[PDB]
Amino acid sequence: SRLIFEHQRRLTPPTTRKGTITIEPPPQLPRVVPPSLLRRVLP
Amino acid sequence: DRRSFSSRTPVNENPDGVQYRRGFVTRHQVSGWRFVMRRIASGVALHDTRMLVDPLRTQSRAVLTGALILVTGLVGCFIFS
């Protein structure tokens, strides 16, 4: 009545590298001193 | 060393923790705006934004230098009279 099936192996789609991607925190608002025209008027 | 105090800011958890409404552009904000608009404006003319060497600002500051030397010579010969 019906045909027969054989347990051929399942194929593997590339799975996930289920790791822990880590990200470095940004810099820390470096303090900038006033421009100071006296030492800024040379040109 | 000199024991510096890196800028810090916690929370409030009270009544005076949402009352200020003071709009005043700090120096950092205007620097940041300048930089962002000079990294976008260098992303539609150079088509790369690693920002290692910016020639656009170079051009603009060159024309500005022309203008400044212009006005300098103008007055330095206005003193001639």
d(CA B41, CA A15): 40
Asked if the Cβ–Cβ distance from B7 to A31 is below 8 Å, we say yes
Query: How far from B7 is each of A23, A28, B4, B10, B45, CA to CA, in Å?
Result: 23, 9, 9, 11, 38
The count of domains in chain B is 1
Contacts of A31 (CB under 8 A, 6+ apart): B7
d(CA B7, CA B31): 18
Q: Which domain holds residue B63?
A: 1-81
d(CA B51, CA B43): 9
Closest-CA residue of B relative to A29 is B7
| Burial status of residue B38 (CB atoms within 10 A of its CB: 0-12, 13-18, 19 or more) | middle
User: Is residue A33 less than 8 Å (CB to CB) from chain B?
Assistant: no
Final resolution, Å: 3.7
- Residue B45 contacts residue B56 (beta carbons within 8 Å): yes
Asked if the Cβ–Cβ distance from B6 to A32 is below 8 Å, we say no
Please give the method by which this entry was determined: cryo-EM
Query: How far from A23 is each of A7, A26, B15, CA to CA, in Å?
Result: 45, 9, 36
- Residue B35 contacts residue B28 (beta carbons within 8 Å): no
